[PDB]
């Protein structure tokens, strides 16, 4: 019916990390401050070149 | 696959089927090219095209060996930024691949082993190459990734509240605190440490958190 | 409602009655750490308070807890042994 | 004189500079005739150059090279059932493989290692032949030829220094075997030196449990008999004498638990010594102190073996760890399944002292999970403090979801189908789903079955089951038994213990019958209902709506939830009607599933599988006829077709079914005869006793990659469903089924294949001593 | 199917079958299960028509010549083992010196039986079963045992003269190192690729020579385990180590005159300057003693488990574990007589003594042979 060329296709995919999650940092009062970046969750937020996601392809 | 042929025509058949989308048969060229010519000039780029083709043909451990190969074969190379990105991009796709997303089912509560390994590579990209052709891309991963690993540990730390393990509530969300300074899963964990304190009669310690609740409400 | 059968709930990281007799106010954290080791909870941002809090719930028979927090100072010398029993 | 250029012809994956650095004289270096010869063996020292001819045109070098690199392939021609990758592991050890060089001198040397591969097995009647077959530009395919004659096999054991125990009894006590008779057929008996060394320690423990505390083995010497077969073994032991466990001397850091330690050392002074029993009791301390929190109790026993009275005294030196080791725990293997599914499945809490058994308790809950492959972990002590252990539960999950068996009836007779599928906690979310049903041009049926098994923290098992069978038995219309049967079943799961668990629910069933078959026994239920139907013409219609309390209880001490080996399984299931039901009756049911390992390597397990059930009426009624017990086909007896165990009813001579189906579905109508005709379809009794007698057996021909996934079991499946209140006056010319000797006997083999959609169980089985009235299917297709 | 996949090694059973002299038996009498298909260092003795035949299960006889009727018969399977009439399990061969029949046991309970009746002259438990025949000479029951020990025992009661350590193989790397007496030295071979001379008088190593390496990291044959029995031509030992190294060497120091490391050798005699041997391929060769140079050879018997090569009825008699007899030429390797008198196989050596040729076959056991 709908299949007309014997596909192996029309299947799932991914988008999620192109919808990058905004994060709300510390606002805690003084003296009540915790070393909340003690984990590895501190990246150099750097925007060197290329697109994001599926626009960014190569050979 | 391809017999002992001119190395370019195997690559030409590869560059055909790379651009045909026939990674079913591009990998039939690119491996057979690397079968007898891995020492050729583009044969390192064949491995880079293998990582390209393994990903589009969903061959992630075969990509991972090839990415690890290019770590060893070319530890001095311009396309290590590609190799560093595609390792985490594998570890993106290796971590979760279920079709439940159309049903809206969360997979951040699913195991982030490669998502932690992508948190190495995407961050080792923006560390090791903060300028590269994938650095705008990899930063978008880590911003999404940081709350994703948080919502993992949030869904863990939710259960001790459901278990009533208030000792295991606090140290998990303190784990969420010290790891994640900013994630909303930790921001939603911000009321919960206050609660377990009150269940452990640390109301005075809770009201200090309640000011942090008050400070980090917005 | 009242269901007499319920498997128990417990949470350790506490101190026994022998353990509080090992130490006293004036000990350091370290003097306590040779006697009591490490807690599984300290203060999040404040002083050196070492939290040793028992929890136990059998099921439909109330709850059992011993909250024993050991407030050392900023120097780590002990300033408070906060014995807190159940409610 | 001085090299001006190096003419290096022939490279083959060796770079020019990679060989040039191995050369001593390079592009301007002084070259003598020694620098000719120095360059020859240094390029030979690359290990990749078959021939090196360093010459020079006056002074500028010319190196004529022949190339060892890439071996193009390796053919293991006629290897044996012995693994050739393990033979390639002998090749991978020897610096040669595909993509690598091959010197043609090391052929027999690796072949010696190929023979010392077999010599490590115990084979030396074997000859290996590596054929170096040249392939393009230098390359070589390595055809390897394998002529393995026989191996060596365990023949005899000679134990010297033994004085108390016969050698041949120990040959049975050891796994070193020396007979496979025709008068006692057993497993085979080949050689391995690993089997000996453990069976020495078999004998060591054997003397240790006796009290031979001056026992040792001096040496042993297995015969290198001139056959390459004969294993005769001199076993030189020092037996010693018997010593007696006469004093326990526990000591060290007893952690205030020494009284509890004395419970672990409740001994007899003067009993014959058993250090194997001591080996338990040291771990009993580690089980004592582990659940006390001390995951690392340094227990050091010391047998102070007093030879003056031929006794043993037992020093024990104890040093516990720390209590509050359990900081937190980790889980792995929930990449597609829920973490809270895994987080619920434990009993040791994060931030406590160790309950060592609670780890094993929750691992048994992961063993009683069912949707798992492995239950593994890693109790990693996070160092720096003796209070930080992270127990990293790396588990592995098995398949999920399973479709039913369908057969025929589609695209020859309209759009009609037999369906059914499972979801297996709905991909491990926490929603136990298996949904079936069938719309035909004979009936219409659907069934949803949904449960959140842990809907609350006390294992609240959110049971909701709805059914709607628009069953019409469509010959053409309402002529032969329509029954629109529909209603619900809402249940809930109750914990009684950690293996004892209760079941309860309520049952709504509403049925809409019309034009039922002229079976007197079917009417005998309606006569027990007080209704007086036509024993003649099929015209009767019946609307019922029963309200029925359901109940049950289970005992679950059984290892794996998908592939267990030891324990037993109890499941009580029953139903009683409440006032308001259109029929007052009862029906109880009980099934057993015992896993008894025949040998505790667990390749042989007794599977005791039985069925019990009795149900009758309340207040002059009967338990309804659809609640009579059926079997055959799959259910517990294979070798039959379905609904073939039970009593059989008799059609009454009727005339029309409100439509006489013309020479089809004839049940003593006008088109049929006019007489009482008994239908051999098993209409089932009020009592059920049918058994499945199954025997786990391993397969010696399947790779255990998935021989673990399959489950082979033989059976004689048999039993009797019979009606204790069946009549012999209405059924005088028919069988009376108050006999429980209505014994339908069959026998055959179970053939499981665990597909990605779960187990595909098949069965060839034949009845031999079967009671009559059975429809038999020999090879059957089950799920 | 799995039984139908393993191959075998080919043989050369019997080309050029000649009977140009007729072969026959002195007598054929078969004392029965004993030597057996079971591997046995046990081997009979023959003296003065008192044909000392025996059985490893316990029965010990003496037979009469020309008929094989029993001169006497006893058993040593009396109270042995763990259930009182076990098999005797004899390791070392039948040794008769004086009125004592000495046989080494796999129980390591060595014996001496009175040659008139078979009554026990003495019996003694030794350390380790006998890898050799119990060499009873000079009062010393010289036994190279399984535990790499030299045990000399008294031949009058069994008083162990010494238990001296020898070449110790790792496993029971087989091959009899017979403790032989030569120039007052206890000359014994070795399962470690060595030969040696020890003191006959006390068990003190005169020398031990590296006659190089054996099984273990250079594995030598375990279908052909080397007879490390030394055969000295008075000043020159001609002995095999346990890789088939025939060697001319000193007796006093072991210093090599020539050697034949050539691979495992099955059976052999040093017959003057004509070393007749059962070679590697179960085949026949004549070596000399000035070098191990092939004087003549025969490869008509390949992979036929031959017995020891003896010269009887004028020709080289070699029986086999196929039950055949073969009178090989004392010259270049031709059959002179061929006699399949047994079907059970000859596992024991042809005792070409007392005018006869005595074997104990495997189950067709005592046939005694002439031409």
Curated annotation (Swiss-Prot), chain B:
Topology versus the membrane: Lipid-anchor
CDD domains in alphabetical order: BamD (cd15830)
Cellular compartment(s): Cell outer membrane
Pfam families: YfiO
UniProt GO cellular component terms: Bam protein complex
The keyword Signal appears for this protein: yes
InterPro entries, A to Z: BamD, BamD-like, TPR-like_helical_dom_sf
Top-rank taxon, per record: Bacteria
Oligomer and partners: Part of the Bam complex, which is composed of the outer membrane protein BamA, and four lipoproteins BamB, BamC, BamD and BamE.
Function: Part of the outer membrane protein assembly complex, which is involved in assembly and insertion of beta-barrel proteins into the outer membrane. Constitutes, with BamA, the core component of the assembly machinery.
Family: Belongs to the BamD family.
Name listed for the protein in its UniProt record: Outer membrane protein assembly factor BamD
Source organism phylogeny: Bacteria, Pseudomonadati, Pseudomonadota, Gammaproteobacteria, Enterobacterales
Gene: bamD
From Swiss-Prot, chain C:
UniProt topology in membrane: Lipid-anchor
Keywords: Cell outer membrane, Lipoprotein, Membrane, Palmitate, Signal
Record's keyword annotation contains Membrane: yes
Major subcellular location class: membrane
UniProt record similarity statement: Belongs to the BamE family.
Role description: Part of the outer membrane protein assembly complex, which is involved in assembly and insertion of beta-barrel proteins into the outer membrane.
Subunit structure comment from the entry: Part of the Bam complex, which is composed of the outer membrane protein BamA, and four lipoproteins BamB, BamC, BamD and BamE.
Protein name: Outer membrane protein assembly factor BamE
The organism of origin for this protein: Escherichia coli O6:H1 (strain CFT073 / ATCC 700928 / UPEC)
Lineage: Bacteria, Pseudomonadati, Pseudomonadota, Gammaproteobacteria, Enterobacterales
Gene: bamE
From Swiss-Prot, chain D:
GO terms under cellular component: Bam protein complex
Pfam families: Omp85 (PF01103), POTRA (PF07244)
Boundaries of every POTRA domain copy: 1-68, 69-149, 152-240, 243-321, 324-398
Chief location: membrane
Keywords: Cell outer membrane, Membrane, Repeat, Signal, Transmembrane, Transmembrane beta strand
One of the GO biological process terms: Gram-negative-bacterium-type cell outer membrane assembly
Subcellular localization: Cell outer membrane
HAMAP family assigned to the protein according to its UniProt record, in alphabetical order: OM_assembly_BamA
Role description: Part of the outer membrane protein assembly complex, which is involved in assembly and insertion of beta-barrel proteins into the outer membrane. Constitutes, with BamD, the core component of the assembly machinery.
Binding partners and assembly: Part of the Bam complex, which is composed of the outer membrane protein BamA, and four lipoproteins BamB, BamC, BamD and BamE.
Protein family membership: Belongs to the BamA family.
Protein's UniProt name: Outer membrane protein assembly factor BamA
Organism of this sequence: Escherichia coli O45:K1 (strain S88 / ExPEC)
Protein's gene: bamA
């Amino acid at each position: 019916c709908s299949s007309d060329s014997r596909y192996k296709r029309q299947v799932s995919g991914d988008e999620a990390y192109l919808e990058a999650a905004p994060l709300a940092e510390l606002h805690a009062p003084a003296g009540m401050i915790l070393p909340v970046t003690s984990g590895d969750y501190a990246i150099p937020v750097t925007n060197g070149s290329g697109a994001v996601g599926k626009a960014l392809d190569i050979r | 696959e391809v017999p002992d042929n001119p190395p370019n025509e195997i690559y030409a058949t590869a560059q055909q089927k790379l651009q045909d989308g026939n990674w079913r048969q591009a990998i039939t060229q690119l491996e057979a090219l690397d079968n007898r010519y891995p020492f050729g000039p583009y044969s390192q780029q064949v491995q880079l095209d293998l990582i390209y083709a393994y990903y589009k043909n969903a061959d992630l451990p075969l990509a991972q060996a090839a990415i690890d190969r290019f770590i060893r074969l070319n530890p001095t190379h311009p396309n290590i930024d590609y190799v560093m990105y595609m390792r985490g991009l594998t570890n993106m796709a290796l971590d979760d691949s279920a079709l439940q997303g159309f049903f809206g089912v969360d997979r951040s509560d699913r195991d982030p082993q490669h998502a932690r390994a992508a948190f190495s590579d995407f961050s080792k990209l923006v560390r090791g190459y903060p300028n590269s052709q994938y650095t705008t891309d990899a930063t978008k991963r880590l911003v999404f990734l940081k709350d994703r690993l948080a919502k993992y540990e949030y869904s863990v730390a939710e259960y001790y509240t459901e278990r009533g393990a208030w000792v295991a509530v606090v140290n998990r969300v303190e784990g969420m605190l010290r790891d994640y300074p900013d994630t909303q899963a930790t921001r939603d964990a911000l009321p919960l440490m206050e609660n377990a304190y009150r269940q452990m009669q640390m109301n005075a310690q809770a009201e200090k958190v309640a000011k942090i609740i008050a400070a980090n409400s917005s | 409602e009242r269901v007499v059968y319920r498997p128990d709930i417990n949470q350790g990281n506490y101190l026994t009655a022998n353990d509080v007799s090992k130490i006293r106010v004036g000990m350091t954290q370290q003097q306590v750490a040779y006697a009591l080791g490490t807690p599984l909870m300290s203060d999040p941002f404040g002083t050196n308070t070492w939290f040793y809090v028992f929890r136990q719930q059998p099921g439909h028979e109330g709850v059992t807890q011993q909250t024993l927090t050991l407030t050392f100072n900023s120097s780590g010398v002990l300033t408070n042994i906060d014995n807190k029993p159940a409610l | 004189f001085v090299v001006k250029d190096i003419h290096f012809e022939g490279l083959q994956r060796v770079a020019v500079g990679a060989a040039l650095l191995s050369m001593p004289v390079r592009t301007g270096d002084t070259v003598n005739d020694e620098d000719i010869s120095n360059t020859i063996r240094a390029l030979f020292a690359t290990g990749n150059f078959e021939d090196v001819r360093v010459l020079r045109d006056g002074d500028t070098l010319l190196v004529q090279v022949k190339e060892r690199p890439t071996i193009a392939s390796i053919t293991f021609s006629g290897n044996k059932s012995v693994k050739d990758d393990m033979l390639k592991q002998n090749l991978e050890a020897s610096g040669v493989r595909v993509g690598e060089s091959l010197d043609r001198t090391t052929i027999a040397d690796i072949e010696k290692g190929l023979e010392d591969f077999y010599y490590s097995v115990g084979k030396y009647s074997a000859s290996v032949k590596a054929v170096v077959t040249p392939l393009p530009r230098n390359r070589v395919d390595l055809k390897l030829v394998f002529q393995e004659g026989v191996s060596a096999e365990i023949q005899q054991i000679n134990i010297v220094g033994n004085h108390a125990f016969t050698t041949d009894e120990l040959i049975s006590h050891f796994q070193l075997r020396d007979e496979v008779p025709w008068w006692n057929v057993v497993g085979d008996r080949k050689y391995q030196k690993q089997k000996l060394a453990g069976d020495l320690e078999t004998l060591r423990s054997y003397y240790l449990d006796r009290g031979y505390a001056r026992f040792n083995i001096d040496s042993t010497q297995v015969s290198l008999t001139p056959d390459k077969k004969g294993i005769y073994v001199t076993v030189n032991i020092t037996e010693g004498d018997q010593y007696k466990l006469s004093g326990v001397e526990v000591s060290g850091n007893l952690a205030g638990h020494s009284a509890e330690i004395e419970q672990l050392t409740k001994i007899e002074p003067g009993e014959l010594y058993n250090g194997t029993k001591v080996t338990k009791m040291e771990d009993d301390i580690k089980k004592l102190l582990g659940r006390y929190g001390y995951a690392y109790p340094r227990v050091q026993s010391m047998p102070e073996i007093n030879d003056a009275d031929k006794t043993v005294k037992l020093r024990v030196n104890v040093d516990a760890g720390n209590r509050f080791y359990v900081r937190k725990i980790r889980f792995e293997g929930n990449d597609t399944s829920k973490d809270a599914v895994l987080r619920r499945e434990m009993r040791q809490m994060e931030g406590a002292w160790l309950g060592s058994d609670l780890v094993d308790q929750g691992k048994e809950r992961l063993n009683r999970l069912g949707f798992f492959e492995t239950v593994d972990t890693d109790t990693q002590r996070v160092p720096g403090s003796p209070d930080q252990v992270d127990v990293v539960y790396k588990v592995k999950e098995r398949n999920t979801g399973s479709f039913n068996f369908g057969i025929g009836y589609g695209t020859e007779s309209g759009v009609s189908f037999q369906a059914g599928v499972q979801q297996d906690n709905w991909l491990g979310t926490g929603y136990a789903v298996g949904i079936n049903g069938t719309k035909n041009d004979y009936q219409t049926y659907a069934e949803l079955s949904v449960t959140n098994p842990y809907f609350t923290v006390d294992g609240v098992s959110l049971g909701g089951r709805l059914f709607y069978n628009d069953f019409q038995a469509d010959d053409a219309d309402l002529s032969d038994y329509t029954n629109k049967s529909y209603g619900t079943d809402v249940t809930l799961g109750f914990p009684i213990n950690e293996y004892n668990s209760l079941r309860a629910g309520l049952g709504y069933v509403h049925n809409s019958l019309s034009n039922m078959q002229p079976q007197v026994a079917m009417w005998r239920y309606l006569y027990s209902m007080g209704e007086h139907p036509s024993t003649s013409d099929q015209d009767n219609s019946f609307k019922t709506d029963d309200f029925t309390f359901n109940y049950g209880w289970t005992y679950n001490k059984l290892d794996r939830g998908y592939f267990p080996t030891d324990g037993s399984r109890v499941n009580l299931t029953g139903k009683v009607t409440i006032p308001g039901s259109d029929n007052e009756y009862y029906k109880v049911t009980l099934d057993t599933a015992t896993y008894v390992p025949i040998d505790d390597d667990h390749k042989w397990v007794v599977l005791g599988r039985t069925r019990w059930g009795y149900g009758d009426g309340l207040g002059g009624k009967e338990m309804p006829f659809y609640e009579n017990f059926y079997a055959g086909g799959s259910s517990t007896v294979r070798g039959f077709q379905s609904n073939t165990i039970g009593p059989k009813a008799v059609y009454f001579p009727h005339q029309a079914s409100n439509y006489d189906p013309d020479y089809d579905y004839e049940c003593a109508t006008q088109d049929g005869a006019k007489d009482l005709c008994k239908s051999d379809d098993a209409v089932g009794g009020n009592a059920m006793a049918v058994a499945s007698l199954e025997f786990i057996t391993p397969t010696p021909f399947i790779s255990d990659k998935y021989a673990n996934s399959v489950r082979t079991s033989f059976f004689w499946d048999m039993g009797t469903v019979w009606d204790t209140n069946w009549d012999s006056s209405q059924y005088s010319g028919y069988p009376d089924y108050s006999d429980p000797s209505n014994i339908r006997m069959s026998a055959g083999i179970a053939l499981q294949w665990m597909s990605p959609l779960g187990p595909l169980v098949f069965s060839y089985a034949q009845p031999f001593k079967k009671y009559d009235g059975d429809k038999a299917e020999q090879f059957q297709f089950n799920i | 199917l799995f039984n139908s996949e393993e191959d075998v090694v080919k043989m050369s059973p019997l080309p050029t079958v000649e009977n140009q002299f007729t072969p026959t038996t002195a007598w054929s009498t078969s004392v029965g299960s004993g030597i057996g298909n079971f591997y046995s260092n046990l081997h009979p003795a023959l003296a003065d028509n008192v044909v000392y035949a025996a059985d490893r299960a316990g029965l010990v006889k003496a037979l009469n010549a020309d008929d094989g009727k029993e001169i006497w018969s006893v058993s040593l399977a009396e109270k042995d083992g763990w259930f009182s009439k076990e098999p005797a399990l004899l390791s070392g061969g039948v040794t008769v010196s004086g009125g004592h029949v000495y046989i080494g046991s796999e129980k390591a309970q060595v014996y001496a039986l009175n040659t008139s009746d078979g009554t026990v002259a003495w019996q003694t438990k030794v350390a380790g079963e006998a890898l050799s025949r119990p060499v009873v000479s000079d009062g010393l029951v010289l036994i190279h045992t399984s535990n790499g020990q030299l045990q000399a025992l008294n031949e009058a009661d069994g008083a162990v003269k010494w238990t001296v350590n020898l070449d110790m193989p790792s496993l029971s790397l087989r091959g009899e190192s017979a403790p032989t007496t030569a120039f007052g030295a206890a000359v014994v071979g070795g399962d470690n690729g060595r030969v040696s001379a020890v003191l006959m008088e006390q068990g003190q190593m005169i020398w031990q020579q590296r006659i190089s390496q054996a099984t273990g990291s250079t594995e030598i044959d375990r279908l052909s385990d080397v007879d490390t029995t030394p055969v000295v031509v008075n000043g020159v030992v001609f002995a095999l180590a346990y890789n088939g190294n025939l060697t001319a060497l000193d007796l006093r120091s072991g210093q090599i005159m020539w050697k034949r490391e050539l691979g495992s050798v099955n059976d052999f005699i040093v017959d003057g300057n004509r070393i007749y041997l059962v070679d590697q391929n179960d085949r026949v060769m004549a070596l000399t003693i000035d070098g191990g140079v092939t004087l003549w050879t025969q490869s008509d018997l390949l992979h036929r488990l031959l017995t020891s090569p003896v010269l009887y009825n004028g020709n080289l008699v070699v029986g086999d574990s196929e039950g055949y007899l073969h009178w090989i030429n004392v010259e270049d390797g031709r059959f002179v007589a061929q006699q399949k008198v047994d079907s059970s196989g000859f596992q024991t050596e042809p005792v070409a003594a007392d005018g006869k040729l005595l074997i104990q076959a495997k189950d067709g056991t005592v046939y005694s042979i002439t031409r």
